[PDB]
Design an enzyme around this catalytic site. Sequence first.
Site, mmCIF file in Angstrom:
data_model
loop_
_atom_site.group_PDB
_atom_site.id
_atom_site.type_symbol
_atom_site.label_atom_id
_atom_site.label_comp_id
_atom_site.label_asym_id
_atom_site.label_seq_id
_atom_site.Cartn_x
_atom_site.Cartn_y
_atom_site.Cartn_z
ATOM 1 N N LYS A 43 -3.860 1.972 -1.604
ATOM 2 C CA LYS A 43 -3.063 1.226 -0.666
ATOM 3 C C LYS A 43 -3.928 0.316 0.156
ATOM 4 C CE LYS A 43 -0.204 2.351 3.164
ATOM 5 N NZ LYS A 43 0.681 3.419 3.719
ATOM 6 N N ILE B 197 2.218 -1.333 -7.759
ATOM 7 C CA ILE B 197 3.328 -0.412 -7.814
ATOM 8 C C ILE B 197 4.273 -0.741 -6.697
ATOM 9 C CG2 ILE B 197 4.114 1.967 -7.739
ATOM 10 C CD1 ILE B 197 1.091 2.774 -7.681
ATOM 11 N N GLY B 198 3.734 -0.921 -5.502
ATOM 12 C CA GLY B 198 4.569 -0.994 -4.307
ATOM 13 C C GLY B 198 4.222 -2.201 -3.462
ATOM 14 N N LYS C 185 0.270 -3.326 0.351
ATOM 15 C CA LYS C 185 0.405 -3.326 -1.114
ATOM 16 C C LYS C 185 -0.170 -2.043 -1.679
ATOM 17 C CE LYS C 185 1.482 -7.735 -0.845
ATOM 18 N NZ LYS C 185 2.872 -7.930 -0.334
ATOM 19 N N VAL C 186 0.476 -1.485 -2.697
ATOM 20 C CA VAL C 186 -0.105 -0.391 -3.438
ATOM 21 C C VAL C 186 -0.442 -0.772 -4.866
ATOM 22 C CG1 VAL C 186 0.075 2.007 -4.032
ATOM 23 C CG2 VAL C 186 1.304 1.097 -2.058
ATOM 24 N N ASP D 294 12.665 11.005 8.764
ATOM 25 C CA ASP D 294 13.248 10.038 7.867
ATOM 26 C C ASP D 294 13.014 10.396 6.418
ATOM 27 O OD1 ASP D 294 14.758 7.741 7.210
ATOM 28 O OD2 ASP D 294 12.967 6.465 7.134
ATOM 29 N N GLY E 15 5.539 -5.220 4.288
ATOM 30 C CA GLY E 15 5.308 -6.458 5.026
ATOM 31 C C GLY E 15 3.865 -6.884 4.840
ATOM 32 N N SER E 16 2.939 -6.040 5.294
ATOM 33 C CA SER E 16 1.498 -6.315 5.158
ATOM 34 C C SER E 16 0.779 -5.259 4.277
ATOM 35 C CB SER E 16 0.849 -6.396 6.549
ATOM 36 O OG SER E 16 0.564 -5.107 7.057
HETATM 37 C C1 LIG Z 1 2.884 4.345 -11.167
HETATM 38 C C2 LIG Z 1 4.239 4.534 -10.467
HETATM 39 C C3 LIG Z 1 5.376 4.033 -11.360
HETATM 40 C C4 LIG Z 1 4.464 5.991 -9.989
HETATM 41 N N1 LIG Z 1 3.549 6.399 -8.923
HETATM 42 C C5 LIG Z 1 3.791 6.144 -7.608
HETATM 43 N N2 LIG Z 1 4.975 5.634 -7.177
HETATM 44 C C6 LIG Z 1 5.156 5.360 -5.869
HETATM 45 C C7 LIG Z 1 4.138 5.606 -4.920
HETATM 46 N N3 LIG Z 1 2.926 6.125 -5.282
HETATM 47 C C8 LIG Z 1 1.783 6.449 -4.644
HETATM 48 C C9 LIG Z 1 1.688 6.299 -3.177
HETATM 49 C C10 LIG Z 1 1.067 7.315 -2.483
HETATM 50 C C11 LIG Z 1 0.949 7.265 -1.075
HETATM 51 C C12 LIG Z 1 1.471 6.166 -0.346
HETATM 52 C C13 LIG Z 1 1.366 6.040 1.167
HETATM 53 O O1 LIG Z 1 1.486 4.915 1.595
HETATM 54 N N4 LIG Z 1 1.126 7.079 1.991
HETATM 55 C C14 LIG Z 1 1.056 6.951 3.459
HETATM 56 C C15 LIG Z 1 0.328 8.151 4.086
HETATM 57 C C16 LIG Z 1 -0.275 6.754 4.217
HETATM 58 C C17 LIG Z 1 2.099 5.128 -1.069
HETATM 59 C C18 LIG Z 1 2.206 5.208 -2.468
HETATM 60 C C19 LIG Z 1 0.865 6.957 -5.540
HETATM 61 N N5 LIG Z 1 1.451 6.921 -6.763
HETATM 62 C C20 LIG Z 1 2.705 6.410 -6.599
#
Ligand SMILES: CC(C)CNc1nccn2c(-c3ccc(C(=O)NC4CC4)cc3)cnc12
EC number: 2.7.12.1
Length: 256
Positions: free
Chosen positions: A38, A16-17, A23-24, A132, A20-21
């Site tokens: 993540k 999904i995401g 990945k999701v 932010d 730098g280091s």
């Molecule tokens: C499948 C996609 C098109 C829609 N779902 C999502 N789109 C964007 C981000 N998504 C997350 C997600 C949830 C949390 C984090 C995250 O990095 N959180 C920081 C506290 C440590 C990063 C990504 C969980 N699900 C998603």
Amino acid sequence: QSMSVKGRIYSILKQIGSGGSSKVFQVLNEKKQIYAIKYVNLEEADNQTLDSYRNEIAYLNKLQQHSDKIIRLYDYEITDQYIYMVMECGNIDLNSWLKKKKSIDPWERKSYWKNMLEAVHTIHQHGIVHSDLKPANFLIVDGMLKLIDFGIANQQVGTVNYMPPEAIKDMKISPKSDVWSLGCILYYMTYGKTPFQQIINQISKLHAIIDPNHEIEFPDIPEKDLQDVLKCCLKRDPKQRISIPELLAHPYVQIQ
Ligand SMILES: CC(C)CNc1nccn2c(-c3ccc(C(=O)NC4CC4)cc3)cnc12
Ligand code: NA
Ligand code: NA
Ligand code: NA
Ligand code: NA
Ligand code: NA
């Protein structure tokens, strides 16, 4: 491609995401439940950076219990080389949902606003100011908005459209700063743009944001209450700007 976190195995579905280091991934577990994992590679990370990462994880693990408007963290695995975080998978980020959107049901907007206040209120109670905040920081899941992060770990982003005046001058921060950002978000959700989106130039934009004689425009709309929230959130002087606990009692969220 499968991965293992704390002994349990997860089949990848897609990325999904990125970062730098970081990945999701969207994954499934053994019972065919779907999660987002993540992965952070730590090989190249400084002591301070690691420390920023460990702090955010401790805060997410904790604050989870105090609101369900904060994304779920189910488990994590951490070593000197990597972090894996098993988290709740959402339906779509608020920013993507907002870009590809004709207009918004007033009811939906109100309900999404309530969720943003709740989540941010929660982090403020624990002494965190995000600083932010942007649409991309919120995630739609089962018609609710969830906060995805707390602003604490190091490092669509760059944008300044949501940045409060006192964050431009100051280059300490107060929770009033999150209220400006939330305010720009709801301005987007009301008028279909942010309050300075017209100024393509970056430097005029920053000067417009800080300058007390650049009057922000509030076109009339049926909901006078929403017009009022917005004006109260977008006061340039933090000490005049409405607070979160005040916003929680505002007719806009309480009345009807
Ligand atoms: C499948 C996609 C098109 C829609 N779902 C999502 N789109 C964007 C981000 N998504 C997350 C997600 C949830 C949390 C984090 C995250 O990095 N959180 C920081 C506290 C440590 C990063 C990504 C969980 N699900 C998603
Ligand atoms: Na509304
Ligand atoms: Na963060
Ligand atoms: Na702004
Ligand atoms: Na703007
Ligand atoms: Na409100």
